[PDB]
Amino acid sequence: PQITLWKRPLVTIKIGGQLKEALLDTGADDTVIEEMSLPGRWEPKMIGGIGGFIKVRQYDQIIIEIAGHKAIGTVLVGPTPVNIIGRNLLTQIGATLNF
């Protein structure tokens, strides 16, 4: 897929058997998903963004399918206004920005 940017780049993902919508974000180092139950151990972390810092639960080596492509890596879960797929996962599906 060659995704143009006139609209927000929304993609369907499947995490924990659950389908959700997420924004492919090249300005995010990591991947933060809204509060949900995820099987596994998780370590408490803090990340920051434009408005400041938020507390998240950190899950390692989670299997996640982004637009059909699979990836296995870290997923942070917490109070984000929107689900974001960061660079840690976008590199796994071989996404690049072009112009």
Ligand X SMILES: CCCC[C@H](NC(=O)[C@H](C)NC(=O)[C@H](CCC(=O)O)NC(=O)[C@H](Cc1ccccc1)NC[C@H](CC(C)C)NC(=O)[C@@H](NC(=O)[C@@H](N)CCCNC(N)=[NH2+])C(C)C)C(N)=O
Binding stretches for a copy of itself (CB under 8 A)? 1-6, 8-9, 23-29, 32, 47-54, 67, 69, 80-82, 84, 87, 90-91, 93-99
When asked if residue 86 is in the footprint of ligand X (CB under 6 A), the reply is yes
Residue 5's binding partner among a copy of itself, ligand X, none (Cβ under 5 to 8 angstroms by kind) is: a copy of itself
| 11-14: long-range contacts, CB 8 A cutoff, minimum separation 24 | 11/66, 11/67, 11/85, 12/67, 13/64, 13/65, 13/66, 13/67, 13/83, 13/85, 14/64, 14/65
Site for ligand X in 18-47 (CB under 6 A): 23, 25, 27-30, 32, 47
H or E stretch including 71? strand 69-77
Q: Which is nearer to a copy of itself, 53 or 61 (CB)?
A: 53
